[PDB]
Structure 1
């Protein structure tokens, strides 16, 4: 089959009541079942609309407020899928696996692939030199059940985010895939998307067509809003992408979507309500990739579009960019820092007076809640008119752009093209990437621009 119905669910999760000591296994199962009822409502809706696969969010079933012991009652010992097990049909094969059983049955009775995130526990002995002192590993685990309810993939999150002290890290990164009549799929979780393993190995070495992506992502503007960066990543890596995000505006958790190599196909962003949302979209089983892009070709082919600028430092996500302020309603600007030069050409729909935009270049190591080397070229709307706010989270803008064109002398080929509009809206089909590394507008933007960014990762320099 050449196309398939993809679904993602944004889940307003029921969080376990605050308790000082760990709950019983029955209370744990009761809370997880409260979440699975809602998730099943989504799965049934997707099946009734003919979906082939549905992704649900990270931590969607038991939440994220845990220490090791208070999490333990929620864990199940999840076997390796090579055991060839359908929990729905052979319950009791392995013992105390009710959550796996219910996920299996949801996948089977609704004839739909189900991707869910749950907790794995793996007992270990002192025989094991890295057994944790409390006698077991606990892993943040994606499980996939096929349309028959078979366990076809289990993935332990490699790159733990801060505040995940309830979990352990696998001894080695797990490259987990599963094959289907509608393509080869790879899986990783939330923070993983910012690192090489497994996320980049899946695409570059195992050539998967589609990533399934449970996430509990807290938006960090201007470059790391969920929809913005996930769709940008799918575009740069050239895969389909099913991002299923928690809904929790209080913590800036919102943004779910279905993304394709050529464009975003569906997306959701909602800070106002507490409702979940099911998204569906058609995808090609095996997409085309246009010619690969040399991200520094064009940028290395110009001389600076501007010289003797008034440059200044301004802070984006604790990273200090070198900025030049955009003064004219249209202009050609170049900005450099260390090894990275960023070129912008732009014509705004109008000069909104109390709105300031800037072009910034960053080339260095990020260290706050994550260590990773970055090369970023960004056109962005400054939070206020104060140049000290250029880089701060900005959610709204009024300046639309008639045209833009951004490029950079990137020292990496992993560069993810981002375009975000006011109110955190994607711009599907309004822009393109050329083979020589320009991200440019195909027409005037449909809404005011928050950012146009080329976000590049230099994994070797971590």
Structure 2
């Protein structure tokens, strides 16, 4: 059993902004301008045989708001158990034009529609957790099935810095929807960096596929959208539908359809101001059974390199312990605290003025969010100057003939990243072993930007 998946990267129409909150008529007019663009993508996806389409987070109203400027864009999204086809019973819950439009878009095109809108929940001064505003506001994903029915409502758990227009739910919402093409889980953007609901959906609810609306700001060398999202899909052994905002000015680009074995289709574009519809087939019930012990090989072996020239290098505000790669072939081991990284490599050639390092990181990230990390990285240094290792590098010339990366990870949640020049994925050029090794299967098709094993220690957050 297979199905055709679709994702749309959206060049959104943002509100003029701001000073005084707009009227509902003004807020709706803008939302409709974006909805007409998404209508265009939903119709082509359906015309091309897609069973489901994901549209990005904030695709309908943007990310620039305060609680009051956001209010006019919000709808009361009922509990999905309510059993409702907004396209067929338009006024069941009062004024809900966005839900009606999304419902008609899913019904008329006979396709599942995943979209991200805003929820309003009026509350009383009686309940303690009610805001002084008199309402809860949530960044909400909605799923409409092929018949137009609301089958999922998900309020974002992990709000990012400056998402002050939204509220965090009391308890994490573990939202799934079942179809004839597998069990589906859903979460949004920053959620992918945390345990709840992200990990829970995969390990406890045994979902086949994750639908992921995102408005992601790219951060090289490890946190580029296509790079990390496909890494997470591979590490969690699940299908992954990533639909991103297209805004190169904020480094927003990178949508794709990912399988447990490799990427299936991806899109990265920093040049044009245009959106992109992507389609690809996936297995409805992929195998999830391929277990990896991430510390096995690494904890067995002894240090591959002795007495080495080591230095501190900054990666996304985190101080990694590096070791320069001297030679067109080598065996290095670098440790930072509880983590020890091993690398075996052989380059296609020894390209001049191109420096590579092997890095190790064991510690807590605190800049613009807090999360414990354990990272082993083979990265291309931006320049020859060793103090530029870990700074975002977008191009490279060194193809590798072979690589094998591993670490003494104190976690079972490790995401294998392989990124080529210029933000290109490498399907299916690498594989992960039951031993916890990220290794090449053929020489890389393009130059290497990074080969990382991105570890996550949820308890140490």
Which residue number in structure 1 is paired with residue 302 of structure 2? 303
Q: Is the 8 A contact 2:85 2:148 kept in 1?
A: yes
Deviations 1:160-192 (A, max 9, x none): 011211101101110000000000000000000
Note the alpha carbon deviations across 1:2-53, whole angstroms, 9 max, x for none.
1111000000000011231011000100000000000000000001001000
User: Alpha-carbon deviation of 1:416?
Assistant: 0.4
Deviation string, structure 1 residues 306-355 (Cα, Å, up to 9, x no partner):
01011000000111000000111110000001111000000011111201
Do the aligned residues in 1 keep the contact of 2:237 with 2:290 (CA within 8 Å)? no
- CA distance in 1 between counterparts of 2:274 and 2:289 reads 38
Match of 2:75 in 1: 76
CA–CA distance in 1 between the matches of 2:454 and 2:99? 38
**Which position in structure 2 is the counterpart of 1:10?**
9
Kindly indicate whether the alpha-carbon contact (under 8 Å) linking 2:118 and 2:140 is maintained by their aligned counterparts in 1: yes
Shift of 1:369: 1.1
Q: What 5-or-longer segments of structure 1 have no aligned partner?
A: none
- Report the Cα offset of residue 125 of structure 1: 0.6
TM-score, structure 2 normalization: 0.99
SS at match of 1:360: strand
Cα distance in 2 for residues equivalent to 1:36 and 1:438: 44
Flag structure 2 segments of 5+ consecutive residues without an equivalent.
Answer: none
Matched residue SS, 1:193: helix
Q: Deviations over 1:259-283 (max 9, x none)?
A: 0001100000000001100000000
Q: SS state of the match for residue 364, structure 2? A: strand
Q: Report the CA distance between 1:385 and its aligned residue.
A: 1.1
- 1:63: Cα distance to partner? 0.5
Map of 2:95 onto structure 1: 96
Match of 1:423 in 2: 422
Q: What is the distance in 1 between the residues matched to 2:18 and 2:160? A: 23
Q: Considering only aligned residues, what root-mean-square deviation do their CA atoms show, in Å?
A: 0.6
Partner in structure 1 of residue 192 of structure 2: 193
**Dislocated runs of 4+, deviation >2 Å:** none
CA distance in 2 between counterparts of 1:46 and 1:291 reads: 31
For each residue in 1:287-309, what CA deviation from the matched residue of structure 2 results, as whole angstroms up to 9, or x when unmatched? 01353011110011110000101
- In 1: Cα distance, 2:73 partner to 2:5 partner: 29
Distance (Å, rounded) in 2 between the aligned partners of 1:335 and 1:69: 51
Contact 2:214 2:244 in 1 (8 A): yes
SS at match of 1:103: helix
Mapped partners of 1:49, 1:127: distance in 2:
51
**Is the CA contact 2:120–2:136 (under 8 Å) kept in the aligned structure 1?**
yes
Where 2:353 maps in the other structure, the secondary structure is coil
Taking structure 1 as the reference length, the TM-score comes to 0.99
How far apart are residue 424 of structure 1 and its match?
0.2
Tell me if 1:135 matches 2:137: no
The offset of 1:113, in angstroms, is 0.2
Q: SS in structure 1 opposite 2:157? A: coil
Listed one character per residue, the Cα deviations across residues 232-269 of structure 1 (whole Å, up to 9, x for unaligned) are: 00000010000000000000000000000011000000
| C-alpha distance in structure 2 between counterparts of 1:6 and 1:44, whole Å | 14
- Equivalent position SS for 2:100: helix
CA distance in 1, matches of 2:95, 2:184: 29
Give, in whole Å, the separation in 1 of the partners of 2:127 and 2:84: 27
Work out the CA distance in 2 between the residues paired with 1:391 and 1:445. 21
The alpha carbon displacement at 1:69 in A equals 0.4
Query: What is the distance in 2 between the residues matched to 1:291 and 1:47?
Result: 33
Q: CA deviation at 1:227?
A: 0.3
Deviation at 1:384, TM superposition (A): 1.1
8 Å CA contact retained: 2:380, 2:448: yes
Per-residue deviation, residues 111-142 of structure 1 (Å, max 9, x unmatched): 00000000001000111101101111100000
Question: Partner of 2:42: helix, strand, or coil?
Answer: helix
The alignment covers a number of residue pairs equal to 461
Provide the rounded CA distance (Å) in 2 between the counterparts of 1:436 and 1:19.
54
Alpha-carbon distance between aligned partners in 2 of 1:366 and 1:289, rounded to the nearest angstrom: 30
- Looking at structure 2, the residues matched to 307 and 166 of structure 1 have their Cα atoms a distance apart, in angstroms, of 53
Q: Matches of 1:394 and 1:90 in 2, distance apart?
A: 53
Q: Is the 8 A contact 2:161 2:368 kept in 1?
A: yes
